[PDB]
Structure 1
């Protein structure tokens, strides 16, 4: 199945050092990798290097690995390379701003996880591949895209001279692999409402023990979710254009349903362009706000995320009310 990088690509990636005008920019939560496509692979390296030092991974091996991940992201409008890095960056901003709650082992596990979390995404929904009647969905029947996503990483990781977790004890590897597993799975949005109702509880009966593992796995889970939707937390004009990027996928899925004589839901129906504003308000309200609210509640330093959400919400509001 697998795709790999060439020497050209990877040895260009080592040779990259990030401009200085972008160093403080990158440490923000609202930061926008938008105009630096060019730089994306290197940004991922820069972040890895700061978080986990410049000797967690053999540079040669990490570079090769990052570029190959890239080679496996399909050219789809939203669930593509750009989505992976944006998400990763966000996880970086969170790791950096809680610089003592997480292990070196999670920090690297997690940034890796994000980069890989939507690997080989087709631009179709779990729903859609189950609904009718895909081969991928006749092997992973639950959280389909997500399991695939994980299988990809794991095959990439095992490719010749890509394994970046090599120099770890074979049960410290059988550990960071286990982190990444749950990490990516947690981004099955269906899983999130359960997971977030659970946390909400724990916190508010003062019973959330970060010492207990299954507790860790939950918060991690929410963090992944939180990064996964973080489009909502960039500044308004950024967020606007990312939304355009999402419906392009949805409307494509929805068009393929129509083609088969059927009624796509309102979200994936393009003949409903201008229901979107409210759609968004809806999303924000039942999804985003509770997400960032519960993550702000657990990890207070991430409040800058909740604030950019609120700011965006009332921008979609002005839009629905007719004043933007």
Structure 2
């Protein structure tokens, strides 16, 4: 049968946490299939169905600066690196579901936060009062799964199918960063007091939720030029949202105000200290082989400190 292969530099570097998928969009589908085949097997999905699904997912990501098809595939690769480094901790269904979840987790993102949809009074904010965009992302995933020829899970039983769609629903909802703070605290406390138990389903749910946050934030784990250039795309979205907040007659939060451009280096420090470093610290305690993500995050925090000292 038909293995996907990659050129040698990609074949070796795709295994590393800090891999950058590159600027050649037409190679991203192959990179993803390559990752499914090695983390899941050539038997997991019917190739023709998997390809149809991938191409429909791509079409349902928008041309926005950050929450785009490149972000989706980036987040899936960080998940591939976690899965491949913790071979024996994950079930066959988890292997199947989580790469799909990561590819789907921002489907049909418009470049605006849950908070902007609520203030604008977008219809999605009436349909979904909390985690607004994330319930939408999961809803788009089920839509694409039900297009003809797109059921990549057709070989699973009724109960296995329901289990995988539950793994995907929870992984996608967990990417709402408002939910992350509490999840990480519960995980920290369970780890410290020795109650953490990976046979407990609700414990696994929290661990998978944290892996989702880690994958979603993985721009902070890259080589510094990747980190720094991704930050430009992140603020390009945030600042457009700030502009829209000002059109509604509302002072945006600092993060989203382009007039506070100068404070970016200090905003990045708060972000690394409040979100990123604690995310990868807890992840590393639970899954020791994920330590390269924490080491790379720490390295990028030093680079933001250098930008503030005027050395970078």
User: What is the TM-score with the length of structure 1 in the denominator?
Assistant: 0.94
Does structure 2 conserve the Cα–Cα contact (< 8 Å) formed by 1:14 and 1:60? no
**Partner SS state of residue 306, structure 2:** helix
**Partner SS state of residue 85, structure 1:** helix
Shift of 1:263: 1.2
Shift of 1:32: 0.6
Does structure 2 conserve the Cα–Cα contact (< 8 Å) formed by 1:14 and 1:59? no
Which of 254, 267, 283 does residue 295 from structure 1 map onto? 283
Tell me: CA distance 1:20–1:58, structure 2 relative to 1, closer, same or farther (3 Å).
Answer: same
Q: In structure 1, how many angstroms separate the alpha carbons of the residues matched to 2:112 and 2:49?
A: 32
1:126-152 C-alpha deviation (Å, 9 max, x unpaired): 011112311110100110000000000
Moved more, 155-164 or 28-37: 28-37
Shift of 1:38: 2.4
**Partner SS state of residue 57, structure 1:** coil
Moved more, 260-269 or 145-154: 260-269
Shift of 1:14: 8.6
Tell me: CA distance 1:123–1:14, structure 2 relative to 1, closer, same or farther (3 Å).
Answer: farther
Q: In structure 1, how many angstroms separate the alpha carbons of the residues matched to 2:284 and 2:34?
A: 26
Q: In structure 2, how many angstroms separate the alpha carbons of the residues matched to 1:148 and 1:262?
A: 25
Q: In structure 1, how many angstroms separate the alpha carbons of the residues matched to 2:249 and 2:91?
A: 52
Does structure 2 conserve the Cα–Cα contact (< 8 Å) formed by 1:14 and 1:63? no
Does structure 1 conserve the Cα–Cα contact (< 8 Å) formed by 2:211 and 2:283? yes
Shift of 1:116: 0.2
Does structure 2 conserve the Cα–Cα contact (< 8 Å) formed by 1:187 and 1:224? yes
Shift of 1:274: 1.1
Alignment partner, residue 234 of structure 1: 222
Shift of 1:17: 4.3
Moved more, 42-51 or 261-270: 261-270
1:40-78 C-alpha deviation (Å, 9 max, x unpaired): 111000000101111111110000000110000011000
Shift of 1:15: 10
Does structure 1 conserve the Cα–Cα contact (< 8 Å) formed by 2:28 and 2:73? yes
The answer to whether structure 1 residue 20 and structure 2 residue 5 are counterparts is no
Q: In structure 1, how many angstroms separate the alpha carbons of the residues matched to 2:171 and 2:123?
A: 24
Q: In structure 2, how many angstroms separate the alpha carbons of the residues matched to 1:157 and 1:20?
A: 33
Does structure 1 conserve the Cα–Cα contact (< 8 Å) formed by 2:5 and 2:11? no
Q: In structure 2, how many angstroms separate the alpha carbons of the residues matched to 1:65 and 1:48?
A: 13
Alignment partner, residue 153 of structure 1: 141
Tell me: CA distance 1:33–1:243, structure 2 relative to 1, closer, same or farther (3 Å).
Answer: same
1:259-313 C-alpha deviation (Å, 9 max, x unpaired): 2333111111111111100000010000001000000010000000000000000
Moved more, 283-292 or 266-275: 266-275
Tell me: CA distance 1:243–1:14, structure 2 relative to 1, closer, same or farther (3 Å).
Answer: farther
Shift of 1:37: 2.2
Alignment partner, residue 217 of structure 1: 205
Tell me: CA distance 1:39–1:263, structure 2 relative to 1, closer, same or farther (3 Å).
Answer: same
User: What is the TM-score with the length of structure 2 in the denominator?
Assistant: 0.98
Q: In structure 2, how many angstroms separate the alpha carbons of the residues matched to 1:16 and 1:263?
A: 50
Which of 30, 35, 45 does residue 57 from structure 1 map onto? 45
Does structure 2 conserve the Cα–Cα contact (< 8 Å) formed by 1:129 and 1:137? yes
Q: In structure 1, how many angstroms separate the alpha carbons of the residues matched to 2:171 and 2:252?
A: 30
Q: In structure 2, how many angstroms separate the alpha carbons of the residues matched to 1:265 and 1:248?
A: 15
Moved more, 32-41 or 229-238: 32-41
**Partner SS state of residue 87, structure 2:** coil
Q: In structure 1, how many angstroms separate the alpha carbons of the residues matched to 2:70 and 2:116?
A: 23
Does structure 2 conserve the Cα–Cα contact (< 8 Å) formed by 1:87 and 1:228? yes
Tell me the C-alpha RMSD between the 2 structures. 1.4
Q: In structure 2, how many angstroms separate the alpha carbons of the residues matched to 1:15 and 1:53?
A: 10
**Partner SS state of residue 296, structure 2:** helix
